[PDB]
Amino acid sequence: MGDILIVNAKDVDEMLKQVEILRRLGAKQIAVESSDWRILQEALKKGGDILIVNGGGMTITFRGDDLEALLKAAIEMIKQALKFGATITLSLDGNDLNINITGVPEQVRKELAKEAERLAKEFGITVTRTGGGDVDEMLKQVEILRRLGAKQIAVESDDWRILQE
Amino acid sequence: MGDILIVNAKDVDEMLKQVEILRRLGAKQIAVESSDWRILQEALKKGGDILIVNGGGMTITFRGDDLEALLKAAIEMIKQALKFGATITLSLDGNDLNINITGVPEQVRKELAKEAERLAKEFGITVTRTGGGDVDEMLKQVEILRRLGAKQIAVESDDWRILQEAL
Ligand SMILES: [Ca+2]
């Protein structure tokens, strides 16, 4: 119970179902959090009171057809990231193994980014990471939500010291 | 740049630093999110406008002295959790290896919990559930936040089909 109920969903249909359950129970302030801009745009059109943007950390994505190679490189990334005190968030989306690193300064996210490149070609997979270009993309997608008529938008980050830059 | 800025921190000092940076940049609505109740209580005393409770999924914690045994138990938990489509969040805090599992229904959180118990025996470490599946404890900690003077509280979950009992 609380003043604001936040639905965290990576599936757009499951997001709608939980918003309907909370709205039918009388919840006045339902928020929807997702790293998927389409889920946030769908929550705006279907009943979301607040839209929460996930703009924290750095996401490393290993891609490959051999699952015993994506995990092999992900485990070494986890072991080294935990040794720096980072928080690691993993999900497997098709052939994409997404790894989000939070809780470490920008100097350590680059160390892990350079190790991810070394782990990619060492196991024959591909690596991609997020950068400053995603910040510009974030402000643009936020303005697309404002122009679609979003009244309350929240932006979440683990490090507002670098994000202000 | 949005109406609400949310500080997600697991370190109390880093939380205070980022709230101070945003307040001096003119942010009118600063929120603080943490799975640590003390960080939420410290953000309330700092002047946080919104406290976000993490009430989603299930948190299992491996404890032990051999780090390459907390890891290997965590690695096997990741392998099976990914086979269910789950999102896995890990952090290493002292001798505690915290594993949070979201995006899966109640029957899968139970099965992974029983596998964590089976993996703790195979590697000689201890596993406990340090979060999730205890709505009364969550509600009581929320009521401690109101009585300390929290005027805006947010509760976050990936599974309101089960958490609707809190309402
Ligand atoms: Ca959140």
Side-chain angles (χ1 to χ4, degrees), chain B residues 7-33:
Chain B
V7 179
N8 191 322
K10 292 297 299 184
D11 182 81
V12 58
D13 294 314
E14 183 69 15
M15 180 274 295
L16 294 175
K17 183 171 77 70
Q18 296 193 29
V19 172
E20 185 71 25
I21 290 177
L22 298 176
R23 195 62 95 188
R24 278 146 79 168
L25 287 170
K28 290 97 176 62
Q29 280 204 274
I30 301 172
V32 173
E33 172 177 2

PDB file of all heavy atoms in Angstrom, chain B residues 7-33:
ATOM      1  N   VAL B   7      16.526   9.037  -7.469  1.00  0.00           N
ATOM      2  CA  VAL B   7      17.874   8.608  -7.118  1.00  0.00           C
ATOM      3  C   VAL B   7      17.791   7.151  -6.685  1.00  0.00           C
ATOM      4  O   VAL B   7      17.166   6.829  -5.669  1.00  0.00           O
ATOM      5  CB  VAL B   7      18.484   9.477  -6.010  1.00  0.00           C
ATOM      6  CG1 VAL B   7      19.879   8.977  -5.662  1.00  0.00           C
ATOM      7  CG2 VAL B   7      18.521  10.938  -6.428  1.00  0.00           C
ATOM      8  N   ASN B   8      18.405   6.264  -7.465  1.00  0.00           N
ATOM      9  CA  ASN B   8      18.476   4.844  -7.144  1.00  0.00           C
ATOM     10  C   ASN B   8      19.862   4.569  -6.573  1.00  0.00           C
ATOM     11  O   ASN B   8      20.852   4.553  -7.310  1.00  0.00           O
ATOM     12  CB  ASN B   8      18.206   3.987  -8.380  1.00  0.00           C
ATOM     13  CG  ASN B   8      18.002   2.516  -8.043  1.00  0.00           C
ATOM     14  OD1 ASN B   8      18.665   1.965  -7.164  1.00  0.00           O
ATOM     15  ND2 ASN B   8      17.078   1.874  -8.748  1.00  0.00           N
ATOM     16  N   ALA B   9      19.932   4.339  -5.264  1.00  0.00           N
ATOM     17  CA  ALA B   9      21.211   4.150  -4.598  1.00  0.00           C
ATOM     18  C   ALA B   9      21.131   2.993  -3.615  1.00  0.00           C
ATOM     19  O   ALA B   9      20.102   2.785  -2.966  1.00  0.00           O
ATOM     20  CB  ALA B   9      21.647   5.426  -3.865  1.00  0.00           C
ATOM     21  N   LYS B  10      22.222   2.235  -3.527  1.00  0.00           N
ATOM     22  CA  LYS B  10      22.411   1.233  -2.488  1.00  0.00           C
ATOM     23  C   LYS B  10      23.464   1.653  -1.476  1.00  0.00           C
ATOM     24  O   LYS B  10      23.719   0.917  -0.516  1.00  0.00           O
ATOM     25  CB  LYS B  10      22.789  -0.116  -3.109  1.00  0.00           C
ATOM     26  CG  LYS B  10      21.665  -0.761  -3.902  1.00  0.00           C
ATOM     27  CD  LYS B  10      20.472  -1.077  -3.009  1.00  0.00           C
ATOM     28  CE  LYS B  10      20.854  -2.062  -1.912  1.00  0.00           C
ATOM     29  NZ  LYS B  10      19.689  -2.463  -1.073  1.00  0.00           N
ATOM     30  N   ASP B  11      24.083   2.813  -1.671  1.00  0.00           N
ATOM     31  CA  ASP B  11      25.016   3.400  -0.722  1.00  0.00           C
ATOM     32  C   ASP B  11      24.406   4.676  -0.162  1.00  0.00           C
ATOM     33  O   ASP B  11      23.961   5.542  -0.923  1.00  0.00           O
ATOM     34  CB  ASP B  11      26.357   3.700  -1.390  1.00  0.00           C
ATOM     35  CG  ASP B  11      27.370   4.268  -0.426  1.00  0.00           C
ATOM     36  OD1 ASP B  11      27.997   3.480   0.314  1.00  0.00           O
ATOM     37  OD2 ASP B  11      27.533   5.504  -0.403  1.00  0.00           O
ATOM     38  N   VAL B  12      24.393   4.794   1.166  1.00  0.00           N
ATOM     39  CA  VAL B  12      23.704   5.917   1.794  1.00  0.00           C
ATOM     40  C   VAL B  12      24.443   7.222   1.518  1.00  0.00           C
ATOM     41  O   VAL B  12      23.820   8.271   1.312  1.00  0.00           O
ATOM     42  CB  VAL B  12      23.530   5.657   3.303  1.00  0.00           C
ATOM     43  CG1 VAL B  12      24.880   5.426   3.977  1.00  0.00           C
ATOM     44  CG2 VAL B  12      22.781   6.805   3.965  1.00  0.00           C
ATOM     45  N   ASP B  13      25.779   7.177   1.484  1.00  0.00           N
ATOM     46  CA  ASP B  13      26.552   8.388   1.223  1.00  0.00           C
ATOM     47  C   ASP B  13      26.388   8.847  -0.218  1.00  0.00           C
ATOM     48  O   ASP B  13      26.264  10.049  -0.481  1.00  0.00           O
ATOM     49  CB  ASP B  13      28.030   8.154   1.540  1.00  0.00           C
ATOM     50  CG  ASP B  13      28.281   7.924   3.015  1.00  0.00           C
ATOM     51  OD1 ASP B  13      27.735   8.692   3.834  1.00  0.00           O
ATOM     52  OD2 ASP B  13      29.029   6.983   3.354  1.00  0.00           O
ATOM     53  N   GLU B  14      26.381   7.907  -1.165  1.00  0.00           N
ATOM     54  CA  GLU B  14      26.164   8.271  -2.559  1.00  0.00           C
ATOM     55  C   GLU B  14      24.754   8.807  -2.782  1.00  0.00           C
ATOM     56  O   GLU B  14      24.556   9.699  -3.616  1.00  0.00           O
ATOM     57  CB  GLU B  14      26.431   7.062  -3.456  1.00  0.00           C
ATOM     58  CG  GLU B  14      26.303   7.334  -4.945  1.00  0.00           C
ATOM     59  CD  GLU B  14      27.397   8.244  -5.473  1.00  0.00           C
ATOM     60  OE1 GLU B  14      28.410   8.441  -4.764  1.00  0.00           O
ATOM     61  OE2 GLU B  14      27.240   8.765  -6.598  1.00  0.00           O
ATOM     62  N   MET B  15      23.769   8.283  -2.045  1.00  0.00           N
ATOM     63  CA  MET B  15      22.411   8.818  -2.111  1.00  0.00           C
ATOM     64  C   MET B  15      22.373  10.274  -1.662  1.00  0.00           C
ATOM     65  O   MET B  15      21.770  11.124  -2.326  1.00  0.00           O
ATOM     66  CB  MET B  15      21.472   7.969  -1.249  1.00  0.00           C
ATOM     67  CG  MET B  15      20.021   8.435  -1.228  1.00  0.00           C
ATOM     68  SD  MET B  15      19.644   9.701   0.006  1.00  0.00           S
ATOM     69  CE  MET B  15      19.939   8.809   1.530  1.00  0.00           C
ATOM     70  N   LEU B  16      23.000  10.573  -0.521  1.00  0.00           N
ATOM     71  CA  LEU B  16      22.997  11.940  -0.007  1.00  0.00           C
ATOM     72  C   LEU B  16      23.689  12.894  -0.971  1.00  0.00           C
ATOM     73  O   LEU B  16      23.252  14.038  -1.145  1.00  0.00           O
ATOM     74  CB  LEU B  16      23.670  11.987   1.365  1.00  0.00           C
ATOM     75  CG  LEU B  16      22.965  11.266   2.515  1.00  0.00           C
ATOM     76  CD1 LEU B  16      23.816  11.306   3.784  1.00  0.00           C
ATOM     77  CD2 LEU B  16      21.600  11.888   2.759  1.00  0.00           C
ATOM     78  N   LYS B  17      24.773  12.438  -1.607  1.00  0.00           N
ATOM     79  CA  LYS B  17      25.490  13.284  -2.555  1.00  0.00           C
ATOM     80  C   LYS B  17      24.616  13.633  -3.752  1.00  0.00           C
ATOM     81  O   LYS B  17      24.562  14.794  -4.175  1.00  0.00           O
ATOM     82  CB  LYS B  17      26.774  12.588  -3.014  1.00  0.00           C
ATOM     83  CG  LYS B  17      27.639  13.425  -3.954  1.00  0.00           C
ATOM     84  CD  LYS B  17      28.997  12.777  -4.213  1.00  0.00           C
ATOM     85  CE  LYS B  17      28.908  11.630  -5.209  1.00  0.00           C
ATOM     86  NZ  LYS B  17      28.622  12.098  -6.593  1.00  0.00           N
ATOM     87  N   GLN B  18      23.915  12.644  -4.306  1.00  0.00           N
ATOM     88  CA  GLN B  18      23.134  12.893  -5.511  1.00  0.00           C
ATOM     89  C   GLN B  18      21.879  13.701  -5.216  1.00  0.00           C
ATOM     90  O   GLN B  18      21.443  14.490  -6.061  1.00  0.00           O
ATOM     91  CB  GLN B  18      22.783  11.574  -6.190  1.00  0.00           C
ATOM     92  CG  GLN B  18      24.006  10.830  -6.691  1.00  0.00           C
ATOM     93  CD  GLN B  18      23.652   9.697  -7.618  1.00  0.00           C
ATOM     94  OE1 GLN B  18      22.636   9.744  -8.310  1.00  0.00           O
ATOM     95  NE2 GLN B  18      24.487   8.666  -7.638  1.00  0.00           N
ATOM     96  N   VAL B  19      21.295  13.538  -4.028  1.00  0.00           N
ATOM     97  CA  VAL B  19      20.156  14.372  -3.661  1.00  0.00           C
ATOM     98  C   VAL B  19      20.598  15.820  -3.492  1.00  0.00           C
ATOM     99  O   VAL B  19      19.890  16.751  -3.891  1.00  0.00           O
ATOM    100  CB  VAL B  19      19.484  13.830  -2.385  1.00  0.00           C
ATOM    101  CG1 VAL B  19      18.418  14.794  -1.891  1.00  0.00           C
ATOM    102  CG2 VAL B  19      18.877  12.455  -2.635  1.00  0.00           C
ATOM    103  N   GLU B  20      21.794  16.030  -2.931  1.00  0.00           N
ATOM    104  CA  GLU B  20      22.312  17.383  -2.738  1.00  0.00           C
ATOM    105  C   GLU B  20      22.653  18.042  -4.069  1.00  0.00           C
ATOM    106  O   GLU B  20      22.490  19.258  -4.226  1.00  0.00           O
ATOM    107  CB  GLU B  20      23.543  17.353  -1.828  1.00  0.00           C
ATOM    108  CG  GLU B  20      24.073  18.731  -1.466  1.00  0.00           C
ATOM    109  CD  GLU B  20      23.158  19.466  -0.503  1.00  0.00           C
ATOM    110  OE1 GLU B  20      22.410  18.793   0.236  1.00  0.00           O
ATOM    111  OE2 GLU B  20      23.190  20.717  -0.482  1.00  0.00           O
ATOM    112  N   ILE B  21      23.135  17.256  -5.035  1.00  0.00           N
ATOM    113  CA  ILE B  21      23.466  17.808  -6.344  1.00  0.00           C
ATOM    114  C   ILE B  21      22.202  18.231  -7.082  1.00  0.00           C
ATOM    115  O   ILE B  21      22.153  19.303  -7.698  1.00  0.00           O
ATOM    116  CB  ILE B  21      24.280  16.783  -7.154  1.00  0.00           C
ATOM    117  CG1 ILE B  21      25.677  16.617  -6.559  1.00  0.00           C
ATOM    118  CG2 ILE B  21      24.348  17.173  -8.632  1.00  0.00           C
ATOM    119  CD1 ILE B  21      26.511  15.566  -7.253  1.00  0.00           C
ATOM    120  N   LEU B  22      21.148  17.417  -7.002  1.00  0.00           N
ATOM    121  CA  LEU B  22      19.911  17.746  -7.700  1.00  0.00           C
ATOM    122  C   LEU B  22      19.190  18.911  -7.038  1.00  0.00           C
ATOM    123  O   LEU B  22      18.579  19.737  -7.726  1.00  0.00           O
ATOM    124  CB  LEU B  22      18.999  16.523  -7.765  1.00  0.00           C
ATOM    125  CG  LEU B  22      19.522  15.304  -8.518  1.00  0.00           C
ATOM    126  CD1 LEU B  22      18.537  14.143  -8.408  1.00  0.00           C
ATOM    127  CD2 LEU B  22      19.794  15.656  -9.969  1.00  0.00           C
ATOM    128  N   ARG B  23      19.243  18.993  -5.706  1.00  0.00           N
ATOM    129  CA  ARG B  23      18.568  20.088  -5.017  1.00  0.00           C
ATOM    130  C   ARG B  23      19.225  21.429  -5.324  1.00  0.00           C
ATOM    131  O   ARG B  23      18.539  22.451  -5.438  1.00  0.00           O
ATOM    132  CB  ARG B  23      18.537  19.827  -3.511  1.00  0.00           C
ATOM    133  CG  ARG B  23      17.547  20.704  -2.762  1.00  0.00           C
ATOM    134  CD  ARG B  23      16.114  20.448  -3.221  1.00  0.00           C
ATOM    135  NE  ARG B  23      15.418  19.486  -2.369  1.00  0.00           N
ATOM    136  CZ  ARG B  23      14.216  18.980  -2.634  1.00  0.00           C
ATOM    137  NH1 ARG B  23      13.568  19.340  -3.734  1.00  0.00           N
ATOM    138  NH2 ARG B  23      13.662  18.110  -1.801  1.00  0.00           N
ATOM    139  N   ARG B  24      20.550  21.448  -5.468  1.00  0.00           N
ATOM    140  CA  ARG B  24      21.242  22.681  -5.820  1.00  0.00           C
ATOM    141  C   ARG B  24      21.172  22.992  -7.308  1.00  0.00           C
ATOM    142  O   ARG B  24      21.504  24.114  -7.704  1.00  0.00           O
ATOM    143  CB  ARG B  24      22.698  22.615  -5.353  1.00  0.00           C
ATOM    144  CG  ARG B  24      22.854  22.968  -3.881  1.00  0.00           C
ATOM    145  CD  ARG B  24      23.970  22.191  -3.205  1.00  0.00           C
ATOM    146  NE  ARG B  24      25.293  22.738  -3.488  1.00  0.00           N
ATOM    147  CZ  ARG B  24      26.397  22.377  -2.843  1.00  0.00           C
ATOM    148  NH1 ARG B  24      26.332  21.473  -1.875  1.00  0.00           N
ATOM    149  NH2 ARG B  24      27.564  22.921  -3.161  1.00  0.00           N
ATOM    150  N   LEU B  25      20.744  22.039  -8.132  1.00  0.00           N
ATOM    151  CA  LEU B  25      20.437  22.291  -9.532  1.00  0.00           C
ATOM    152  C   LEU B  25      19.001  22.753  -9.745  1.00  0.00           C
ATOM    153  O   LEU B  25      18.594  22.954 -10.893  1.00  0.00           O
ATOM    154  CB  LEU B  25      20.696  21.036 -10.370  1.00  0.00           C
ATOM    155  CG  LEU B  25      22.159  20.661 -10.607  1.00  0.00           C
ATOM    156  CD1 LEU B  25      22.271  19.276 -11.232  1.00  0.00           C
ATOM    157  CD2 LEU B  25      22.840  21.707 -11.472  1.00  0.00           C
ATOM    158  N   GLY B  26      18.227  22.921  -8.674  1.00  0.00           N
ATOM    159  CA  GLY B  26      16.874  23.426  -8.773  1.00  0.00           C
ATOM    160  C   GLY B  26      15.783  22.392  -8.943  1.00  0.00           C
ATOM    161  O   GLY B  26      14.646  22.769  -9.250  1.00  0.00           O
ATOM    162  N   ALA B  27      16.087  21.107  -8.772  1.00  0.00           N
ATOM    163  CA  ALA B  27      15.060  20.076  -8.879  1.00  0.00           C
ATOM    164  C   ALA B  27      14.007  20.252  -7.789  1.00  0.00           C
ATOM    165  O   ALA B  27      14.329  20.314  -6.599  1.00  0.00           O
ATOM    166  CB  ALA B  27      15.691  18.686  -8.788  1.00  0.00           C
ATOM    167  N   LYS B  28      12.740  20.323  -8.202  1.00  0.00           N
ATOM    168  CA  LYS B  28      11.645  20.550  -7.267  1.00  0.00           C
ATOM    169  C   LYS B  28      11.065  19.263  -6.692  1.00  0.00           C
ATOM    170  O   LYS B  28      10.497  19.288  -5.595  1.00  0.00           O
ATOM    171  CB  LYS B  28      10.527  21.348  -7.945  1.00  0.00           C
ATOM    172  CG  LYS B  28      10.871  22.803  -8.234  1.00  0.00           C
ATOM    173  CD  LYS B  28      11.342  22.997  -9.666  1.00  0.00           C
ATOM    174  CE  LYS B  28      11.585  24.467  -9.980  1.00  0.00           C
ATOM    175  NZ  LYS B  28      12.661  25.056  -9.129  1.00  0.00           N
ATOM    176  N   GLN B  29      11.180  18.141  -7.399  1.00  0.00           N
ATOM    177  CA  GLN B  29      10.652  16.859  -6.932  1.00  0.00           C
ATOM    178  C   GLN B  29      11.734  15.795  -7.078  1.00  0.00           C
ATOM    179  O   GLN B  29      11.949  15.265  -8.172  1.00  0.00           O
ATOM    180  CB  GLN B  29       9.398  16.460  -7.699  1.00  0.00           C
ATOM    181  CG  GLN B  29       8.135  17.147  -7.228  1.00  0.00           C
ATOM    182  CD  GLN B  29       6.895  16.351  -7.574  1.00  0.00           C
ATOM    183  OE1 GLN B  29       6.353  16.467  -8.674  1.00  0.00           O
ATOM    184  NE2 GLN B  29       6.443  15.525  -6.636  1.00  0.00           N
ATOM    185  N   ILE B  30      12.400  15.471  -5.974  1.00  0.00           N
ATOM    186  CA  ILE B  30      13.430  14.441  -5.948  1.00  0.00           C
ATOM    187  C   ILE B  30      12.879  13.224  -5.222  1.00  0.00           C
ATOM    188  O   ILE B  30      12.359  13.339  -4.105  1.00  0.00           O
ATOM    189  CB  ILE B  30      14.716  14.940  -5.272  1.00  0.00           C
ATOM    190  CG1 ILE B  30      15.265  16.165  -6.003  1.00  0.00           C
ATOM    191  CG2 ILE B  30      15.745  13.825  -5.225  1.00  0.00           C
ATOM    192  CD1 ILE B  30      16.421  16.831  -5.282  1.00  0.00           C
ATOM    193  N   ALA B  31      12.978  12.065  -5.864  1.00  0.00           N
ATOM    194  CA  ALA B  31      12.602  10.795  -5.269  1.00  0.00           C
ATOM    195  C   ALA B  31      13.853   9.975  -4.987  1.00  0.00           C
ATOM    196  O   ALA B  31      14.884  10.142  -5.644  1.00  0.00           O
ATOM    197  CB  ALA B  31      11.660  10.009  -6.186  1.00  0.00           C
ATOM    198  N   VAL B  32      13.755   9.085  -4.004  1.00  0.00           N
ATOM    199  CA  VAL B  32      14.844   8.182  -3.653  1.00  0.00           C
ATOM    200  C   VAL B  32      14.282   6.772  -3.609  1.00  0.00           C
ATOM    201  O   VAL B  32      13.314   6.506  -2.887  1.00  0.00           O
ATOM    202  CB  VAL B  32      15.501   8.541  -2.309  1.00  0.00           C
ATOM    203  CG1 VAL B  32      16.517   7.472  -1.917  1.00  0.00           C
ATOM    204  CG2 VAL B  32      16.168   9.906  -2.388  1.00  0.00           C
ATOM    205  N   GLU B  33      14.887   5.874  -4.374  1.00  0.00           N
ATOM    206  CA  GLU B  33      14.491   4.478  -4.421  1.00  0.00           C
ATOM    207  C   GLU B  33      15.620   3.616  -3.881  1.00  0.00           C
ATOM    208  O   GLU B  33      16.787   3.820  -4.228  1.00  0.00           O
ATOM    209  CB  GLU B  33      14.149   4.046  -5.847  1.00  0.00           C
ATOM    210  CG  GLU B  33      13.907   2.556  -5.993  1.00  0.00           C
ATOM    211  CD  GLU B  33      13.510   2.171  -7.397  1.00  0.00           C
ATOM    212  OE1 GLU B  33      13.471   3.069  -8.263  1.00  0.00           O
ATOM    213  OE2 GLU B  33      13.248   0.973  -7.638  1.00  0.00           O
TER     214      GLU B  33
END
